[PDB]
């Protein structure tokens, strides 16, 4: 269920859902697996906020175990294309794709909660058919893996060689280690 709240304005009282109220304050929620429907919905939210105000920071909270790669890459180009600084926060967990959108945020505006956890690994796939077709899909997924590692190094600042060794298998990174790894900037322990 979704609770309804009331926002008081000069014109009068208006009823909004909890998700719509936060959207009015430039806050978007990324929950569950990353798919084509959830991803295509978030892009429309980002664009809508750009037109209303292109100079105010956007906040993106990520709590997801990851999902499809192609659905997530549409969001990466969108965050980089628009002028506003997309602030990212990690709540609960950030898998391979969830971590890529986390680090893709604006430099200096990336935070992680004290008990959050990040996990990164290589792309997963598979194919069944003739050997000629397997070679095609293998070369394609290999370029993505190479492309995803280059961008990871660009935002994290580490070298491409380091990303290659750390992404060969699943690698869990606690919240403090993320700061030391260059993935994030600080931790929002308490309110100041």
């Amino acid at each position: 269920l979704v609770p309804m709240v009331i926002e008081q304005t000069s014109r009068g009282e208006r009823s909004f859902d909890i998700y719509s109220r936060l959207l009015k304050e430039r806050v978007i929620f990324l929950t569950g697996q990353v798919e084509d429907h959830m991803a295509n919905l978030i892009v429309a939210q980002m664009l809508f906020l750009e037109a209303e105000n292109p100079e105010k920071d956007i906040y993106l909270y990520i709590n997801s175990p990851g999902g499809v790669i192609t659905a997530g890459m549409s969001i990466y180009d969108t965050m980089q294309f628009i002028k506003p600084d997309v602030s990212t926060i990690c709540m609960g967990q950030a898998a391979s794709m969830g971590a890529f959108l986390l680090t893709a945020g604006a430099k200096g505006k990336r935070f992680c909660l004290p008990n959050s956890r990040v996990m990164i690994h290589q792309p997963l796939g598979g194919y069944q058919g003739q050997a000629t077709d397997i070679e095609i899909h293998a070369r394609e997924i290999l370029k993505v893996k190479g492309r995803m590692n280059e961008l990871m190094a660009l935002h994290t600042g580490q070298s491409l060689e380091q990303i290659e060794r750390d992404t060969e298998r699943d690698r869990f990174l606690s919240a403090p280690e993320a700061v030391e790894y260059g993935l994030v900037d600080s931790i929002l322990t308490h309110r100041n």
């Binding site: 936060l22 304050e25 920071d57 906040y59 909270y61 926060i89 505006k109 935070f111 309110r191």
Partner: protein
């Protein structure tokens, strides 16, 4: 000729805790005498006149300054109001009435009237309700500000001398206003809300957004200190009118310690008023220091300034004043701190 320190010393007797405001007026008074006293036949010509805009909370003493200033001021002074003014010669009132009122104090001396000073209380009342121009033509809002533009800058206005004996004369006198100074000030309402939006971005719900740390934060007094002309535009004032008033004074809100001084140092304090009220009755009055500290806590709670101070005193002395005339052989009255709270009765001294 009078010095800022000498003129300020006189105002200090009647006003307390408005050090910044006093400086603004003193300079203007000195500048006004300086501007007129000199022949003006110098290399620099058409010296500018800096008008004054007074802003402060309710009952901070804006209207009090205009009254005390006129006492020490030698040049003519008038105390008009912007509530009755109506533009385009409507039935309410005209802008020339301010000048006509000045001559009554000046005895119809045009050359002596141009060098006079003017005060206009409740200037906020003519502020536009909305930022955008009114759909209709406001007769006591934006419209009044427009008519004052040419007046403050300098112009010539028709003035019926003496009102006229009958229709026979049907003439008017022309008087200049380029040299006349204007003191337009009034307590603005809701100005703090506009400045908050522009000073602190805030207004967020997420983690990154900085919600106000406490319920009571960004006090009214602090916001006025950081006021600018652009903020008044959203309030409703036209930039044209504000340009005619470059100076913008600020009156900090009253503080608990200031009120204690207001009851003893000023000559017109409430303590001295009632003391004189009973003096003719052959009865004395006393107010201990312990009683004043409790009264200060109660006054600020009313969010009304010094004008809301009488409510605390008179509510206590209500019963006392009712029984004293009937009573006989009463020579002195003492009001301790407990009486203010209402848990005790004032002590009486008999002859």
């Amino acid at each position: 000729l009078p010095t800022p320190h000498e003129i300020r010393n006189h105002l200090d007797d009647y006003v307390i805790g408005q050090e910044q405001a006093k400086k603004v007026l003193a300079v203007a008074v000195y500048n006004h005498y300086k501007r007129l006293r000199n022949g003006d036949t110098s290399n620099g010509v058409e010296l500018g006149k800096s008008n004054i805009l007074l802003i402060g909370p309710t009952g901070s003493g804006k209207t009090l300054l205009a009254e005390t200033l006129a006492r020490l001021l030698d040049v003519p002074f008038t105390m008009a109001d912007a509530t009755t003014l109506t533009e385009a010669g409507y039935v309410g009132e005209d802008v020339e009435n301010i000048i006509q009122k000045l001559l009554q104090k000046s005895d119809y001396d045009v050359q002596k009237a141009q060098r006079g000073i003017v005060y206009i209380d409740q200037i906020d009342k003519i502020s536009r309700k909305s930022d955008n121009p009114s759909i209709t033509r406001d007769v006591s809002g934006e419209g009044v500000q427009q008519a004052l533009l040419k007046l403050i800058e300098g112009t010539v206005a028709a003035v019926p001398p003496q009102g006229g004996r009958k229709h026979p004369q049907q003439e008017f006198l022309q008087v200049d206003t380029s040299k006349i100074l204007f003191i337009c000030g009034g307590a603005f309402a809701g100005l703090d809300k506009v400045i908050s939006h522009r000073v602190e971005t805030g207004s967020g719900i997420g983690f990154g957004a900085t919600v106000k740390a406490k319920s009571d934060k960004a006090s009214e007094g602090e916001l006025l200190a950081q006021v600018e002309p652009e903020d008044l535009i959203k309030f409703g004032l036209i930039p044209e009118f504000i340009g005619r008033l470059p100076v913008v004074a600020t009156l900090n809100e009253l503080s608990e310690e200031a009120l204690i001084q207001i009851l003893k140092e000023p000559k017109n304090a409430l303590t001295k008023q009632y003391q004189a009220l009973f003096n003719l009755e052959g009865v004395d009055l006393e107010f201990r220091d312990e009683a004043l500290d409790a009264i200060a806590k109660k006054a600020m709670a009313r969010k009304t300034g010094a004008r809301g101070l009488r409510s605390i005193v008179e509510a206590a002395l209500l019963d006392t004043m009712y029984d004293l005339p009937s009573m006989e052989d009463v020579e002195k009255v003492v009001i301790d701190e407990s009486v203010i709270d209402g848990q005790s009765e004032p002590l009486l001294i008999y002859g």
